[PDB]
Design a binder for this molecule. Structure first.
Ligand SMILES: Nc1ncnc2c1ncn2[C@@H]1O[C@H](COP(=O)(O)OP(=O)(O)O)[C@@H](O)[C@H]1O
Ligand SMILES: Nc1ncnc2c1ncn2[C@@H]1O[C@H](COP(=O)(O)OP(=O)(O)O)[C@@H](O)[C@H]1O
Ligand SMILES: NCCC[C@H](N)C(=O)O
Ligand SMILES: NCCC[C@H](N)C(=O)O
Ligand SMILES: [Cl-]
Ligand SMILES: [Cl-]
Ligand SMILES: [Cl-]
Ligand SMILES: [Cl-]
Ligand SMILES: [K+]
Ligand SMILES: [K+]
Ligand SMILES: [K+]
Ligand SMILES: [K+]
Ligand SMILES: [Mn+2]
Ligand SMILES: [Mn+2]
Lengths: 342, 342
């Protein structure tokens, strides 16, 4: 059971309720790299950029292969580090490495010296059966002997999205965090990231629509980038609702959402509006135990009412991009996918 | 000393800091009627309909001759009532009667069996020198004998607005009530109530602009009608800002102002805005000893920064109507005015 303490008081408050301590890498991109070491060389299976930032468990994060925003440059630094780690720790077969990118800096989060859960997706995505390869390495056949020595970068994007069991446990706050709660995953294949993401999103049973009213209620950190999300939604045809401070931020930028009351503020409030079906999209971000506790009503309603919702700004942007794609437009077989690989 | 108490709490509260008790006619139109009685008959000098509701002292209320909203049927009752009083009281000379109209019902405020401060305005409006006649009547010369027996109804609108000394006493809260504080008055003459109001407004040294951003912050009782007012403002090309509760009501009507913070909510706040000359108009209504003391900065700032502001919704509608008029478009002389009277 992890925790992200924000302040001193927070700390106590934690222990009370409650040991390692790690500085939390706020606003960093999380990445996973799957690889194979045969003692002689390292084979990079895949570099997957997560959509949800570090702090949202990698198992609960949607992710993309190839990276959708990371510079090749910083990806090179990761590949090198993966390499140094592989040789140093004497890996023989699969490994997984998790990093956090912040301010153009690579930070190591952990090393899993075995097959990680990302293995099948990377394999489907790249056409290389890494578990068969790594198993051959284990039994003694080298990467070189098997002919699997060069990293494969596919010509299309593969996006992985997860499914959470929150609807099975209503009393739980359907919020993402450092601890993994998802039961499964799906894969979206597209020409662009928007396209992959849209397939991934639909595949994951998302109720997201291409029109309607969107409710925006974001935390302080999010106040800046929210403006841009709000316009993208505007550009797409949605109308907007916003709670107090979010409305303020949007107002100051020129966006004037319809103001909506928090449960405490009066009626009608969000709960009522959600209950009524006024929304087709909800973007709600939060930060701080207490802040989280209050906003619980939103997610709870959103889930109960089947309204698609994002709890991270990164996810919101990803959702916004997919609005530009059409998941039903084109289909492709795995055989065809793999045949496109040069 | 008069004040309106709203609840049990409030009443002691008063008595504390502090005798007749009278029920307060809320959301009522105040009316003034000047009249002459000689024992034989009653001449109606004029029926004036206040812009500001009962609760804002007549003396500080803007007014209209002829009535701009009241039905003929209701004036008829007041006319009826006045006569009854005159004879009843044995009025010989001038008299004044104040009424309040609630739900199509006429309530009697007071009777002043003497010359009222409205006499000169009525005289000027109607061409009938009420003071001369009444004196004559007082000395023994009947209306009949004077040949002043019919109620004159002007072909033009006559609006009286007042001037308040707030600017000379900064420490004071520039807000209207049951006690009179104005020192003078002005008159506006027009083809329409709007044109008349517009002249009276300009006459009163108002800083009202025909463009800019308006700030709307209104009470509960007003939250409903404010929509129409907001619409007018928008139709006129103003941009709107609203405090929370007001913003909620508008938005719920399709009207999304720019949300703004009270002083206690954040920076920038209203005071700041005002201070920055961000507004050209402010509509601020309040109810309650506290809601009032809490809004004080709005009015003080507004007065101090020379921004035109109205403290009644009625006053705000009038201001709006006047936006459709040109005070400097047409001029007329008292002589012509009177010449127009048949
Ligand atoms: N220092 C950190 N800064 C930001 N996020 C972190 C940090 N440490 C861990 N996390 C978050 O916690 C998650 C799980 O931590 P990790 O060490 O990988 O635990 P696990 O063994 O459960 O897989 C990560 O996937 C990440 O999103
Ligand atoms: N019962 C009432 N309901 C509403 N407003 C009232 C009532 N009584 C007085 N007022 C308001 O207070 C003002 C002053 O009361 P009034 O008896 O006329 O006082 P004054 O002697 O100063 O002229 C009125 O002009 C009116 O707007
Ligand atoms: N990849 C996690 C699922 C995202 C979920 N809609 C949310 O953002 O909370
Ligand atoms: N006739 C009263 C003065 C009007 C002023 N703008 C107010 O509404 O406070
Ligand atoms: Cl794993
Ligand atoms: Cl449950
Ligand atoms: Cl008087
Ligand atoms: Cl003073
Ligand atoms: K993550
Ligand atoms: K692990
Ligand atoms: K009045
Ligand atoms: K009096
Ligand atoms: Mn991990
Ligand atoms: Mn009076």
């Amino acid at each position: 059971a992890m925790e992200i303490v924000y302040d001193e008081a927070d700390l106590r408050r934690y222990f009370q309720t409650a040991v390692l301590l790690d500085h939390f890498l706020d606003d960093a991109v999380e990445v996973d790299v799957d690889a194979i070491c045969d003692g002689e060389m390292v084979l990079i299976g895949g570099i997957m950029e997560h959509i949800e930032q570090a702090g949202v468990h990698s198992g609960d994060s949607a992710c993309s292969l190839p990276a959708y925003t990371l510079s090749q440059e910083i990806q090179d630094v990761m590949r090198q580090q993966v390499q140094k780690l592989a040789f140093e720790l004497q890996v023989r077969g699969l490994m997984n490495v998790q990093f956090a990118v912040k301010n153009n800096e690579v930070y190591l989060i952990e090393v899993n010296p075995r097959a990680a859960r990302t293995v099948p997706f990377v394999s489907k995505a790249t056409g290389v059966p890494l578990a068969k390869v790594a198993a051959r390495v284990m039994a003694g056949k080298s990467l070189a002997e098997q002919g699997v020595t060069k990293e494969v970068i596919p010509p299309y994007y593969s996006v992985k999205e997860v499914v959470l069991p929150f609807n099975k446990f209503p009393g739980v706050d359907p919020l993402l965090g450092p601890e993994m709660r998802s039961t499964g995953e799906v894969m979206g294949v597209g020409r662009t990231f928007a396209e992959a993401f849209a397939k991934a999103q639909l595949g994951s049973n998302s109720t997201m629509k291409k029109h309607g009213r969107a409710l925006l209620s974001v935390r302080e950190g999010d106040k800046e980038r929210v403006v841009d999300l709000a316009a993208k939604l505007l550009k797409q045809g949605f109308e907007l609702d916003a709670t107090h401070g979010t409305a303020i931020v949007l107002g100051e930028a020129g966006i004037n959402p319809r103001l909506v009351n928090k449960v405490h503020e009066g009626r009608p409030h969000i709960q009522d509006r959600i209950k009524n079906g006024e929304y087709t999209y909800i973007i709600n971000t939060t930060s701080g135990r207490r802040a989280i506790e209050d906003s619980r009503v939103i997610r709870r309603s959103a889930l109960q009412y089947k309204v698609h919702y994002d709890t991270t700004l990164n996810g919101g942007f990803a959702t916004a991009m997919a609005l530009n794609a059409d998941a039903t437009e084109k289909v492709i077989s795995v055989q065809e996918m793999h045949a496109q690989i040069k």
